[PDB]
Design an enzyme around this catalytic site. Structure first.
Site, PDB file in Angstrom:
ATOM      1  N   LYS A  34     -81.373  32.285   4.503  1.00  0.00           N
ATOM      2  CA  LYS A  34     -80.245  31.383   4.719  1.00  0.00           C
ATOM      3  C   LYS A  34     -80.069  30.375   3.594  1.00  0.00           C
ATOM      4  O   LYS A  34     -78.935  29.989   3.293  1.00  0.00           O
ATOM      5  CB  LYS A  34     -80.423  30.673   6.061  1.00  0.00           C
ATOM      6  CG  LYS A  34     -80.678  31.634   7.233  1.00  0.00           C
ATOM      7  CD  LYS A  34     -79.828  32.906   7.123  1.00  0.00           C
ATOM      8  CE  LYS A  34     -80.079  33.877   8.252  1.00  0.00           C
ATOM      9  NZ  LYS A  34     -79.422  35.186   7.966  1.00  0.00           N
TER      10      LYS A  34
ATOM     11  N   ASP B  34     -73.473  35.950   8.366  1.00  0.00           N
ATOM     12  CA  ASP B  34     -74.127  36.000   9.663  1.00  0.00           C
ATOM     13  C   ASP B  34     -75.029  34.786   9.849  1.00  0.00           C
ATOM     14  O   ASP B  34     -75.477  34.157   8.886  1.00  0.00           O
ATOM     15  CB  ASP B  34     -74.949  37.287   9.793  1.00  0.00           C
ATOM     16  CG  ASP B  34     -75.409  37.548  11.215  1.00  0.00           C
ATOM     17  OD1 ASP B  34     -74.753  37.058  12.156  1.00  0.00           O
ATOM     18  OD2 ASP B  34     -76.434  38.242  11.388  1.00  0.00           O
ATOM     19  N   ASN B  35     -75.287  34.457  11.114  1.00  0.00           N
ATOM     20  CA  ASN B  35     -76.270  33.435  11.475  1.00  0.00           C
ATOM     21  C   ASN B  35     -75.868  32.046  10.988  1.00  0.00           C
ATOM     22  O   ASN B  35     -76.726  31.193  10.754  1.00  0.00           O
ATOM     23  CB  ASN B  35     -77.655  33.794  10.927  1.00  0.00           C
ATOM     24  CG  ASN B  35     -78.128  35.157  11.382  1.00  0.00           C
ATOM     25  OD1 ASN B  35     -78.422  36.030  10.567  1.00  0.00           O
ATOM     26  ND2 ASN B  35     -78.208  35.347  12.691  1.00  0.00           N
TER      27      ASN B  35
HETATM   28 CA   LIG Z   1     -78.654  38.385  10.773  1.00  0.00          CA
END
Ligand SMILES: [Ca+2]
Ligand SMILES: Nc1ncnc2c1ncn2[C@@H]1O[C@H](CSCC[C@H](N)C(=O)O)[C@@H](O)[C@H]1O
Length: 213
Positions: free
Chosen positions: A141, A166-167
């Protein structure tokens, strides 16, 4: 014998070869019944399907392959002649992803680039890439924001290029979101998705003070 090898073995035992949808079902089944794994999942996968279909990319870049679930998900929807590049820094995962793609019959549409995104992205021009149509961010991330800026600097985005991350809520990517939302160069849309369960590696650090230096 790793969790990823077990996932691969299960697909090979149970899925219909050459059938990407069958492979997705097998992975989803195994990871909801036997061992959870950090695939994007079927609920998020349906969102990804709609993005692909809506935006009709010819060249897709995926950051973070793991076992190849999202690579199979996206590559199965691509038109003839379209291609998917996926960067994966873990060579064991890349090896697993290739086997997944072979069993799905999608090895002709996907090229796995082994390495870290921050190192491979400045080389994409050398890989005979002009610009990307769509980028799926699903790796570590803290790389979302720097890699996005890196794609800009390297001239790999065109007007209309789609970034799908995503996320962005769990665990969360608030700096990336603040950047693309706040910036006039990015038009942003949020898609919520419910998660029954997610496990991410974490840890504690113990630091014992030994006196000043
Ligand atoms: Ca993911
Ligand atoms: N900087 C980086 N460059 C390339 N891959 C990275 C990376 N940082 C983390 N990764 C990889 O990104 C993966 C995240 S899990 C990704 C799952 C996949 N998108 C799916 O839905 O099926 C891990 O396999 C990890 O090894």
């Amino acid at each position: 014998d790793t969790k990823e090898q077990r996932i691969l073995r299960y697909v090979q035992q149970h899925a219909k070869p050459g059938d990407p949808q069958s492979v997705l079902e097998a992975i989803d089944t195994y990871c909801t019944q036997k061992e959870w794994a950090m695939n994007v999942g079927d609920a998020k996968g349906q969102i990804m399907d709609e993005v692909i279909q809506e935006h009709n990319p010819s060249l897709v870049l995926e950051l973070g392959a793991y076992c190849g679930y999202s690579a199979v998900r996206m590559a199965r929807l691509l038109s003839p002649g379209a291609r998917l590049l996926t960067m994966e820094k873990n060579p064991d995962y890349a090896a697993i992803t290739q086997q997944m793609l072979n069993f799905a019959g999608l090895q002709d549409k996907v090229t796995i680039l082994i390495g870290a995104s921050q190192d491979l992205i400045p080389q994409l021009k050398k890989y005979d890439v002009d610009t990307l149509d769509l980028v799926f961010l699903d790796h570590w991330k803290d790389r979302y924001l720097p890699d996005t800026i890196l794609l800009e600097e390297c001239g790999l985005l065109r007007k209309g290029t789609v970034l799908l991350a995503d996320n962005v809520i769990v665990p969360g990517t608030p700096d990336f979101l603040a950047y693309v939302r706040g910036s006039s160069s990015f038009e942003c849309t949020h898609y919520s998705s419910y998660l029954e369960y997610m496990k991410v590696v974490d840890g504690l650090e113990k630091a014992v003070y030994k006196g000043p230096s």
